[PDB]
Design a protein around this ligand. Structure first.
Ligand SMILES: CC(=O)SCCNC(=O)CCNC(=O)[C@H](O)C(C)(C)COP(=O)(O)OP(=O)(O)OC[C@H]1O[C@@H](n2cnc3c(N)ncnc32)[C@H](O)[C@@H]1OP(=O)(O)O
Ligand SMILES: CC(=O)SCCNC(=O)CCNC(=O)[C@H](O)C(C)(C)COP(=O)(O)OP(=O)(O)OC[C@H]1O[C@@H](n2cnc3c(N)ncnc32)[C@H](O)[C@@H]1OP(=O)(O)O
Ligand code: NA
Ligand code: NA
Lengths: 192, 192
């Protein structure tokens, strides 16, 4: 299980914490002496760096695709799952963002579009296949106000393909040259 | 945790079970009514098939690299780790075999050789990073009568590269065109 040299429960009061390019420390309930926000932001940056590294090891990548730096220079949104009732905290994350994609269609019509993309997604190995990925995915869909078949996925893994099929009945449609994956229903003339 | 529709503790009495192309059922202590060996062998084949599929999902491969069929047609040896004291069994495996490799050296001498190769290796996600991989690797080295720096690795993952460096001080040497990895000391003129 993952761990940091600072109080993650204080930093992240909610079970799922949303962060964007501002990397803004969550507000806390009044009363406690809160560290300086600059220092809280460095804690968040270290968490994102380490989560990105862990995801890269899980995915057999030579370099992370998620980092604090890349958060600050992009318009990515990360959702970080803690357990507040852990004994004796951070479980994983999902990172999304809108991307311009020059997408190939199936009747062969081809074009541009900017869907919300699933960019990185990781649940710690020890608690994979327990339902944490689904909780995190569900929360992200609700906040982004997106439906599953509207997504594009950047280079999904085998585990993720199975996940998407199980939870959302997502079936792949036309392969795409750009290595993003889209599903039946992505195009308006498709069903589901 | 992994699970099968038959008694793995009866099938595999030892914590680490070695199997080769014969896929021979382990002998048991006298007394129990043992199923027919053909049926025990089918149980073993199903275990190897499922372990290979799990390893392929872990590794983001489109197809397994380990299967009962491929065991029977190759000269591969698999070491399967159970826990006999599990509550309320199979943890993972390592697969090895000798392979002819047309290896590129570092003073640029180049040639043929047939080292023992690490071909597949998987510990269930739930108990990765607990020391199970090391126990299994240690047992395999002792049985094969091989030293770590004598090995070649078929397409090691990032996790495995870190593992080998931690436990055995293995540092990569000349990259190889064949996608196998070898370490300093593989060649007789190298140290360690
Ligand atoms: C764009 C990208 O981010 S690609 C990279 C995606 N991330 C990774 O592949 C990293 C490693 N894997 C993980 O981090 C996680 O397994 C995730 C994020 C893919 C899924 O989250 P989880 O918490 O494991 O999933 P959750 O428990 O909610 O759902 C389980 C389902 O996911 C799929 N799944 C999860 N683990 C596996 C596995 N080892 N083998 C096959 N399918 C799996 C299956 O559909 C499974 O349902 P099943 O058990 O009925 O077969
Ligand atoms: C030729 C091939 O088989 S390539 C494919 C290898 N298999 C895989 O990559 C599948 C997924 N991973 C696994 O199955 C396992 O993690 C294995 C087989 C690689 C290693 O077995 P484990 O039981 O996890 O290793 P064990 O606990 O004995 O040793 C731990 C060490 O392995 C490495 N390691 C294990 N998990 C990770 C990880 N998530 N991130 C980075 N390094 C890791 C580290 O060196 C670690 O030591 P550390 O915790 O001090 O950093
Ligand atoms: Na993983
Ligand atoms: Na894994």
């Amino acid at each position: 299980s993952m761990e940091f040299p600072f109080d993650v429960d204080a930093l992240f009061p909610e079970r799922i914490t949303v962060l964007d390019q501002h990397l803004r420390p969550p507000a806390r309930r009044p009363g406690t002496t809160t560290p300086a926000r600059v220092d809280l932001q460095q804690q968040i940056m270290t968490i994102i760096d380490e989560l990105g590294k862990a995801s890269a090891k899980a995915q057999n990548l030579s370099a992370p695709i998620t980092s604090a730096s890349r958060m600050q220079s992009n318009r990515h949104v990360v959702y970080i799952l803690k357990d507040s009732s852990a004994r004796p905290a951070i479980i994983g994350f999902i990172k999304v963002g809108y991307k311009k994609l020059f997408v190939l269609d199936d009747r062969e019509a081809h074009n541009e579009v900017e869907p919300l993309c699933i960019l990185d997604f990781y649940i710690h190995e020890s608690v994979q296949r327990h339902g944490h990925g689904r909780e995190l995915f569900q929360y992200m869909l609700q906040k982004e106000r997106v439906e599953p078949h509207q997504l594009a996925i950047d280079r999904p893994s085998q585990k993720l393909l199975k996940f998407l099929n199980k939870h959302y009945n997502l079936e792949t449609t036309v392969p795409q040259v750009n290595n993003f994956v889209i599903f039946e229903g992505f195009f308006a003339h498709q069903h589901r």
